[PDB]
Design a binder for this molecule. Structure first.
Ligand SMILES: Nc1ncnc2c1ncn2[C@@H]1O[C@H](COP(=O)(O)OP(=O)(O)O)[C@@H](O)[C@H]1O
Lengths: 519, 59, 370, 59
């Protein structure tokens, strides 16, 4: 245990220690940080005290890309919060976790169990400081993986968990074989890692759905939706003979997915090849090329997956909540951290952008703290804001001429390619900004295209493929088909006088919402 | 008077309905037969396109 | 802040917000004034009706289009139409939105000068811009190269583009469009007995044209076939009963686009002016122009027009080129779609004509710079 | 009683008449769409066959 200015650095000991159990060490109640030893229990207690004396919620931002140390610390802090302010919230929280483990974790290049979203566990407290229910809230999720995975990676575990042929009942219900190299949405990188089984984790997720309030239908429906997400990957369309139009050739996976999600097959194919639009007061068919059909299919898959994820998290919040109307809570924020790999891409850029935002948040907090302390000791000393004026210039990525706006523009523009995207980047930024730099590409190493001077160093990015990865055209005709499906889970998902949607835009809006919550 | 008037004119309405239903069935036959013939025609066209592209490569 | 896209056209106003997939408001560009006495005291009679309110009351009104051939020939009526479009159809405040207007190529400069002066003074838009309809159509087609043939209600024009470069010396503008076909059909229907003379009857004939007319692949044998049998005859029912049946008029009306001598014009058909606009281009780009003929506008919506166009151009061009007529199924709103795409680009936000630039330079800035 | 019963049966039969007319016009417009396109692509087939023959002469 250590203190770093304002951080609380803990190191994984890998050796069982009674330094947390029993309460003999938990005597931090009433004690301050500045006097007692530097334990996270001191910080949990400080947040408790601040809630009781200030009526202002508190937040715990724990570093998450570390494989271990974070999870055990989360367990220990929820245990401590149960202990001080005492079928328990800890039991309940760890019960339904296999759902999140299977849905929001995937094999990473530098990991094998990676939190690919943001978990904001809210432990709510009574009017006076009595433990109340605790709801879980999820934030921006790397939905781009549901379709595309790099080489030597693979998407969320649940797909291979299901496809391990553990319950032949499922692989019989979803009209699905077991060979992973038959489904393009999962067979992009590597189909399985040797560092984990899929069958026993499938059993864990089954038991999770059981301890969860899910019925038989709220489980078969989920399995059917995942099977349909796999069946989308190998639908095939061909340009109509001699003019332009994308038409289907063979409807095998079409009929499969149509039966699964509870739709019609001809209706689905027609709505995929002939999307309708409302022009003022009338509807007119819109044409679709092959690549447009593929983009729409991918967008549908991503939307379905995210909707299912959020609905499951709402179900967890429901089954784990029963309590009097309470006032305050403590924020436990789990999220990935900064990344510097050997080959950085769009996803790494988004993650580093989020971490730039969080780091600017921390800098602002620490700046106002130091400035307060100076006004307290009468020390007359004023300096340029140590909070934002560091990264506000490394916020090209959001200002409406930076990288993301340029990428959206290039997603809209005709015949745009990766070379034109690179050219636009260079014309707008190379030489005109100081954080934007041309990479020093040495033969023998992976080629980068530009370099951003982040707070955690200068990272080199390779833009190959960002255009296809940013497109997200939702097909409202197929969504309207979904809203009528027989499979009641699908209709519940899509219950709630468009072609301009991009992953970066949704990501930026989600990040704005998250920062708004934290601020 | 009004009842028998409605009776006669709307029985004639049902007669026009017989006519329109007959012609609708005829038009369904026409549509299905035409789309089948034109699927045959599109087979001919795709085949002859294959023929021309292959043969012009050879040429 | 979002921007407005207001493709005006000479027969239909299509407005909406930059970033949507289709225009939010589509109504006729028409102003109606009461024609008869008015006896019911207290009915609250209006001075004039605009849009499609003037269309349902058309029985007692005299309708006027404020745009004749792409040129705005009545500025009070055009102001009424813009006021309606902003306040009653879109329900916004023009003071809070840049506006992207559109204009056909090769028409007088006073048109654009008055457009921008009207906007900036009697609407106080923060900024505005006047695009060219063919460029926006090409944006919407997802291309950067091709000869686009736009054909709306007032004017038909070709604009050849290559790699995003326009060839302003090969732009060819023609002045027969939907409205002249409507008039020719009104004149041809009299030889069967039907007489439409009123403006409301002109609207009726326009609907007959939009429902029953098509372009014959081979005009002569189509004529002979219509003469021999009677299988080409359809029936239409006016809005008082009284059905009418038309025969060879169905394809004699749009055939005027390919033989403008039917209405006593000396120009050539649209196929021939397209070919001439191509042959006026540099010999290196015309092979790529031949394969990217982009059809746009309402008057290009007849059934069989793409096939006839391809047949004619193939007969004109050398026997080695690949003629491809690109006719999207939503080609009637291509100009608006492209306008929304354009007004949504990040690199476009410096192309607006801000209020301050207008205050410095007068209305003449619209073409002097932008 | 007779009159109103007749009127109601009649109006239901007629409201089925109207949808029969709509489906009839839909069927005939689809059939003519088809046949027109089919003869246009028949002309296309004629062109490509003439090119096939000229190409045979070239071979
Ligand atoms: N389905 C159709 N078939 C044939 N002509 C049509 C059709 N729809 C519209 N038109 C013609 O198109 C004209 C309106 O086209 P539009 O592109 O809106 O004109 P503008 O661009 O000047 O507003 C009308 O005059 C009408 O005659």
């Amino acid at each position: 245990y250590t203190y770093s200015g304002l951080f609380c650095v803990t190191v994984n000991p890998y050796k069982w220690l009674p330094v947390y159990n029993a309460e003999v060490v938990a005597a931090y109640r009433g004690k301050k940080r500045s006097e007692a030893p530097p334990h996270i229990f001191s910080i949990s207690d400080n947040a408790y005290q601040y809630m009781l004396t200030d009526r202002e919620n508190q937040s715990i931002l724990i570093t998450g890309e570390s494989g271990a140390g974070k999870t055990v610390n989360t367990k220990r802090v929820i245990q401590y919060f149960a202990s001080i302010a005492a079928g328990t919230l800890e039991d309940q929280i760890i019960q339904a976790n296999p759902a999140l483990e299977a849905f929001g974790n995937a094999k990473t290049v530098r990991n094998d169990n990676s939190s690919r979203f943001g978990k904001f566990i809210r432990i709510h407290f009574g009017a006076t400081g009595k433990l109340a229910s605790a709801d879980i809230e999820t934030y921006l999720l790397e939905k781009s993986r549901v379709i595309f995975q790099l080489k030597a990676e693979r998407n969320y575990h649940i797909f291979y968990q299901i496809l391990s042929n553990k319950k032949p009942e499922l692989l019989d219900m979803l009209l699905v074989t077991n060979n992973p190299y038959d489904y393009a949405f999962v067979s992009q990188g590597e189909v399985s890692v040797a560092s984990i089984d899929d069958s026993e984790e499938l059993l864990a997720t089954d038991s999770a759905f059981d301890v969860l309030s899910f019925t038989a239908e709220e489980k078969a429906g989920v399995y059917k939706l995942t099977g349909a997400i796999m069946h989308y990957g190998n639908m095939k369309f061909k340009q109509k003979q001699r003019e332009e139009q994308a038409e289907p050739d063979g409807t095998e996976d079409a009929d499969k997915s149509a039966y699964l999600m509870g739709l019609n097959s001809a209706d689905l194919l027609k709505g995929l090849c002939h999307p309708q639009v409302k022009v003022g007061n009338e509807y007119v068919t819109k044409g679709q090329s092959v690549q447009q059909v593929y983009y729409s299919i991918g967008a549908l898959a991503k939307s379905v997956y995210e909707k299912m994820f959020n609905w499951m998290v709402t179900r967890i919040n429901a089954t784990l909540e029963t309590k009097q109307p309470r006032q305050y809570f403590i924020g436990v924020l789990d999220i990935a951290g900064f990344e510097i790999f050997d080959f950085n891409s769009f996803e790494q850029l988004c993650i580093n952008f989020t971490n730039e935002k969080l780091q600017q948040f921390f800098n602002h907090h620490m700046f106002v703290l130091e400035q307060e302390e100076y006004k307290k000791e009468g020390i007359e000393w004023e300096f340029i804001d140590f909070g934002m004026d560091l990264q506000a210039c490394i916020d090209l990525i959001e200002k409406p001429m930076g990288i993301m706006s340029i990428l959206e523009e290039e997603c809209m523009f005709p015949k745009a390619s990766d070379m034109t995207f690179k050219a636009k980047l260079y014309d707008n930024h190379l030489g005109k900004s100081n954080n934007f730099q041309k990479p020093r590409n040495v033969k023998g190493k992976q080629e980068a295209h530009f370099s951003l001077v982040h707070y955690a160093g200068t990272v080199d990015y390779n833009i190959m493929g960002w255009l296809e990865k940013n497109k997200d055209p939702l097909n409202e005709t197929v969504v309207g088909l979904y809203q009528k499906s027989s499979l009641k889970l699908m209709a519940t998902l899509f219950s709630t006088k468009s072609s301009f949607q991009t992953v970066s835009a949704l990501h930026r809006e989600n990040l704005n919402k998250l920062m708004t919550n934290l601020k | 008077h009004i009842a028998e008037d409605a009776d006669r004119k709307y029985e004639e309405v049902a007669r026009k309905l017989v006519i329109i239903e007959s012609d609708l069935e005829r038009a369904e036959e026409r549509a299905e037969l035409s789309e089948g013939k034109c699927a045959e025609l599109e087979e001919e066209l795709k085949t002859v396109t294959n023929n021309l592209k292959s043969l012009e490569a050879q040429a | 802040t979002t921007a407005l896209v207001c493709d005006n056209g000479s027969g239909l106003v299509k407005a909406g917000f930059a970033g949507d997939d289709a225009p939010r408001a589509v109504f006729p560009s028409i102003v109606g004034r009461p024609r008869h006495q008015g006896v019911m005291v207290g009915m609250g009679q209006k001075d004039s009706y605009v849009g499609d309110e003037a269309q349902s009351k058309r029985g007692i009104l005299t309708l006027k289009y404020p745009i004749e051939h792409g040129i705005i020939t009545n500025w009070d009526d055009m102001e009424k139409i813009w006021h309606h479009t902003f306040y009653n159809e879109l329900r916004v405040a023009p003071e809070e939105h840049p506006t992207l207007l559109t204009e056909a190529p090769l028409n007088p400069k006073a048109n654009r000068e008055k457009m921008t002066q009207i906007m900036f003074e009697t609407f106080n838009v923060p900024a505005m811009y006047v695009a060219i309809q063919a460029v926006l159509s090409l944006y919407a087609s997802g291309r950067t190269t091709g000869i686009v043939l736009d054909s709306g209600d007032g004017v038909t024009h070709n604009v050849p583009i290559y790699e995003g470069y326009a060839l302003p010396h090969a732009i060819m503008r023609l002045d027969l469009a939907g409205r002249d076909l409507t008039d020719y059909l009104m004149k041809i229907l009299t030889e069967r007995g039907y007489s439409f003379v009123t403006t409301a009857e002109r609207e009726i004939v326009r609907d007959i044209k939009e429902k029953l007319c098509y372009v014959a692949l081979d005009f002569e044998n189509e004529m002979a076939t219509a003469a021999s049998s009677s299988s080409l005859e359809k029936s239409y029912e006016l809005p008082d009963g009284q059905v009418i049946t038309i025969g060879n008029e169905r394809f004699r009306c749009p055939e005027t686009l390919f033989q403008p001598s039917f209405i006593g014009m000396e120009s050539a058909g649209i196929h021939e002016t397209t070919y001439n606009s191509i042959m006026k281009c540099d010999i290196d780009i015309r092979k790529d122009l031949y394969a990217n003929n982009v059809l746009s506008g309402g008057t290009t919506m007849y059934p069989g027009i793409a096939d006839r166009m391809q047949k004619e151009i193939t007969a004109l061009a050398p026997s080695t080129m690949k003629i491809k007529i690109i006719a999207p199924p939503e080609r009637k709103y291509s100009v608006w779609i492209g306008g929304s795409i354009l007004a949504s680009l990040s690199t476009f936000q410096q192309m607006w004509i801000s209020k301050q630039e207008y205050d410095e330079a007068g209305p003449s800035i619209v073409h002097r710079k932008c």
